[PDB]
DNA sequence: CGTCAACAACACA
DNA sequence: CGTCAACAACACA
């Protein structure tokens, strides 16, 4: 996402407010302290790790139990 | 442990009967089917693995939960 | 390359 | 080599 007000004033981090249905178009940026800045226009993954971690747990746990 | 009767007849595997207090001296060998053969004279470890396995479980589990 | 033996996991009681 | 920043774990509510 992008806007001119983001480069034109003081900001490093920003909180993004959105509607899941509208993520493809318009979001609204807020400062870390809650002040509205402007809106910005738009110009299984980690579960594999979770599962692999689960197996590497269970096998090691049974092996430690015996 | 050792005995002459062990090399002098048919055996591959043997069940050892013992008294924890007498392990340093005399044990009694039995066949896999329970027949007494003779006695034999005597001529933290895995917990480190268990603990390491425990840590590698817990860290991965919290990481999968978040 | 083929077969066998053991270890590990899953299912069952 | 020194300092800083972030991530992860443990303890607390």
UniProtKB/Swiss-Prot annotation, chains A, B:
Annotated compartments: Host cytoplasm
Involved in flaps endonuclease activity: region residues: 47-51
Source superkingdom: Viruses
Quaternary context: Homotetramer. Part of the transpososome complex composed of a DDE-recombinase A tetramer synapsing the ends of the viral genome and the enhancer element. Interacts with target DNA activator B; this interaction brings DDE-recombinase A to the transposition target site. Interacts with host ClpX; this interaction remodels the transpososome for replication and is required for the flaps endonuclease activity of DDE-recombinase A.
Note: This enzyme is structurally similar to and performs the same endonucleotidic reaction as retroviral integrases, RNase H, RuvC holliday resolvases and RAG proteins.
Domain notes: The catalytic domain contains two distinct activities, the cleavage and strand transfer activity and the flaps endonuclease activity. The N-terminal HTH Mu-type domain 1-alpha is responsible for sequence-specific DNA binding to the IAS. Two adjacent regions 1-beta and 1-gamma bind to the ends of the viral genome.
The protein's name: DDE-recombinase A
